[PDB]
């Protein structure tokens, strides 16, 4: 009945509300169907260096998916098989996930139903934390105050300054400004070796933080386990898992007490739902990484849903239909994901 | 926004096309609870439960009728309903009859949700319909009847059959399996089911003899809850051990897979927790590298296996055929999903009246 | 020689001495024998939703057991085999256990001997704790004072309030009122995920509690192990094990340093005695859950007996032959379990 | 309320119907300590101990006589007495001779308790009497005598026999086992017992040859306390390894089962800790999925196996037949519990006088 | 059957139904040429059959000899011998290790007795073909008696005075052969 009829991609470098210590390289995806609906998703390329490559890959993948049914699960299986030799990971897997997210958006539109309801769940608000960067004491404290004013009950800051004392000064200044009934997540963004991570993390633990994220190299699951083994505070990781199979290797060894898959890297909706099944059985509270628009839907269907990360990479090109009430993400009452392009703005940012 | 507006159940004892022969004697009927889940969209979801023994039948019907109070007026959102039932039954024990009743609700809710969207369940789950190889399931039949049933199954187009073994002597098991082989030829599957009847060392001895014979798998060689025991049996075999029909929820499956209890899995759509449980089970089987087959509930399992990354076989054991229209068909031994919304279950209303308890 | 001749069940909703934050759904069981004695037991249905189902199941099981010898061990084997396909767990296993407890009561009567002596043990008093609920600071403190006055040396309170600070306020107020030479057990009743359980439990540990019970989902033995691994205070669990086989899976992985089987869920007397053998070898102090009347006998025969839970669900329909002296349960000098129906009261509560 | 009021012991060296042939020579008698536990109910509990070698006989009798002081005037409550003896001997070591003496008390106390209630022990333990398959136990007999004994056992109705092997050459072991097979035919069990005589690699080599032969199990291939060694031998075999006759208390059994030392178990009613220890052992064997047989003490083991969920075989090796009435009978090779209170042991008082030490 | 694997499948299936201590005779009913008979028979022999009967054309005694020469299992034949003189020709060249005359074709009682004397001298165990009523008598007088064929062609029209106990035919205590017509039944079937 419903077939894919075309794929269009647009590579953009878009401005960010708050610069990271100023633009995000994105691939915006339109998936045309025989039912007249168009699915939308986007990818984050992390670095402009990967941006044209990711767009080129998707365009070259158009011939593989055009005329195939709009069945994301069957499409995912087909792509997994076709890329089994090239390696169904990294940019290839990201591109497949962009297709998956646009296909589920389209399937939601075909049925005139928000994605969360198509998944069999009710919409519910999800607590969100406001994600900042390696901002220094002044700006980190400022941004936390602003977030608290807006109703967010937690913030994340990036740490990993040259000295542990600088990490601690940032956390202490945030804590003074927001008080004790407030979440402070800290992200080391893979910056430390295992011994340095144990030392810094035990000091931060005494400080009072909500979680310690990616203390060491992301692929080092055993290293994360050794760090977690020396901590009472939970270690958080998962944004870098490419597919539920990478997540499964990390969970199988007990690398961390929390998980936060990235909707793109984990494999889109199809991968997210598989990830959610694993986190449930392993008893891991599961949060999101980026992709706040689709992650609101996904978390509502996730048995161990924990936090949504608010980090609005695509706001300059996507209508703000996702809203926050008392720090909670509220899924819009729109079919599929609720992504609507800001078409006038896209033209400004094309690479 | 679509709400559940009613739950009706009917207990029936229905005739089986293949009477099930056991060590005790022959059972000619199956105890089922037929479920109708009414909605504010007007469509009605259909599912059913198998109660296994008439002893459990009225109790299971009573439990579902009492559980109606928990779900009527809730939104038709199976994942959310499941979470609520799991929490409400956390003290009583979200397992056994309670879990089976919750699964009957879940299966009817997904059938209703398919109907709300006028789409076959497989498509709602995001997959394409595909034919799925099916084996014909027989019983503890002895040589004469096993041969007769195997010839019939081959003539119908099936490419495998399953027989129940666990006779008093290993030579009896071997005799039945060898006889089936003569009837079906070499390029044909013979699954064997010990139905939990052996201790570990007897299972290792019998299974090694069966393995030399050429069987497709050895199913539930010992007590179902003894996952460590299945692991010890599997460790001595090249043929795969099959189990899973008795897992109550994905959490039981998870425990068995975590210790490597078997190289194959076959969840029961009811006991595993309905569609919602099956999808979670499918994600575990994929990660653990376990080919996944079905147990009973052929109507819904044809949909579910089409969405299962490691789909293996569909079990054809047609418990509800007297009371459900044969919209599921078989071509070349492969189950063919009907082009109907939801699961494609249409009651045979005139027939149901014959069998009510 | 002695045969079962009949089974009668009565479903009741009975009032509770202290309401849980007010009635208990019970199935009262009479097992008639050819020796003229009648065994008594009862089941707890947890929720009225399961009550009629459990009674119906038992009535339908009557034909399986009538004319069988009064041999609880052989009867248990028969029921295990007959329910091997349906699943010998949940309500079915509970119903089998109700039969088992009434059969051992009858066997005690046949021999005119209290159950504890039939089991080969001497009666001894067993320390009991008074079990309360999620009562708030005022009522929890009140109930603990009342329990201390009555001679109990420990109480259990249910915690898991929205904030950890509320858990702590309850425990601190109880502690002030009862002093330092007194047991305060805390029960989370499966309310927390593993990270939240580690955090709350380490805070409660610093407070001074006797044990932390069911911090997370009961079937999650691995999660309980991970929680226990971060604690000095013992984790307690077991009330939800259906059969000694579930207990064995939890003990085999070291899920908790304490165990408390429920006489019904564990499989009656037959299951309890098996459970007791496992707790002995694994070195686990073993307490009871509910069923105080039979648990007094059972604990006297348990090598690692720890505490009896006083939580009098059936008092409104059972004569108070079990007494407490200095907080210790005293087994009555009566044949079998010492259960005598309050027949006038039963009529008031029939469903 | 019923109190122990006396303990009498008698050391005897009794004639064996089957002299036991060993590598050294033939032993024609067994050293036993016969136990009478008097009570305030008037009934007297009977049990006995096997001392294994006459070297231990007087020491074991002396130990029991001295232990009398701990139990006379205590209530006849075997579980409570056991706890007290375990605590009192915690420093000396609650194992070996001390543990065996405590077990003799326990077995006599349960026999007395059966008598107090005028009920067979099996019924007191909550089970029905059922016949239990028995194998006839022979010794290191060589070809001529093993064949002769095997023919006699088959004529008596036994369906299995056990022979002792561990000759200097593997071909000798094989020769004896093959000869027995000719005498009994193919549908008959042959258990083999190495009686701790091999090192691990020799046991693996010999056992793989025996396995090809068709034996029922391979018993105690290496030193009894080397559980890891039994595990390593079992890991190389399809045939099950059997052990357990030398476990002193359930705690020793527990250590062996925890590492997977063997697929079968056979506690000795004395060494395992009497009835009280046997019941605990039975609960462990059930959970670990181990079929459980007996070692010696056929009179009490017929009761105990009837209460054992994984009951497997009863060992017929009639050490005390000269001094105990043959109230235990065999029909079709199955031990039949006599309808007598307690264990059904009645002393042959005229015979005992012949054999006193 | 058209394929050897089909023959083997049927024989193996029978074996599962009856167990190991039970005879399975196989009859090719003259259907094979000599080399096919040698190939099929060697496969059947590995299977465990009791005998291989009439593997090729009945009058080809030399052909039966050549087939028998390649087998350990015995070749059976003789149902088609017309008179002892035909039996004599086959035995003289060693056509088969077993014989089974048909009471009719061999020449009745008179022919059977002569056939029995030949089978004795040639050392051939001798069974019957059809005519179970008279063959029970005749085999009792046959020094090398082997098996009686139970194939009850005339049961609808002859009283069942021949009985079977433990699979053994029991001669009735009646004069002559013990054949008593079922006169009411015969009328149903007349041509
Ligand atoms: O967790 C994140 O959001 C992230 O790891 C990330 C990584 C990559 C891209 C966007 C966010 C992070 C955010 C801010 C500063 C450092 C790291
Ligand atoms: O696998 C099955 O279908 C089953 O285990 C079963 C169990 C319970 C109900 C229906 C089918 C089985 C099949 C054939 C013979 C015995 C058992
Ligand atoms: O441990 C208990 O007694 C129990 O877990 C329980 C559970 C279910 C029924 C009765 C008692 C508990 C008691 C009071 C409050 C919460 C939990
Ligand atoms: O298993 C036995 O009975 C025993 O180990 C034994 C050991 C010690 C005393 C009695 C029996 C055995 C039997 C036959 C040959 C050698 C050993
Ligand atoms: Mg991060
Ligand atoms: Mg099965
Ligand atoms: Mg509790
Ligand atoms: Mg031995
Ligand atoms: Mg012929």
From Swiss-Prot, chains A, C:
Pfam families: MR_MLE_C (PF13378), MR_MLE_N (PF02746). Its EC number is 5.1.2.2. Coiled coil: none annotated. It catalyses: (S)-mandelate = (R)-mandelate. It comes from the Bacteria. SMART domains: MR_MLE (SM00922). One of its GO terms (molecular function) is mandelate racemase activity. This is Mandelate racemase. The lineage of its organism: Bacteria, Pseudomonadati, Pseudomonadota, Gammaproteobacteria, Pseudomonadales.
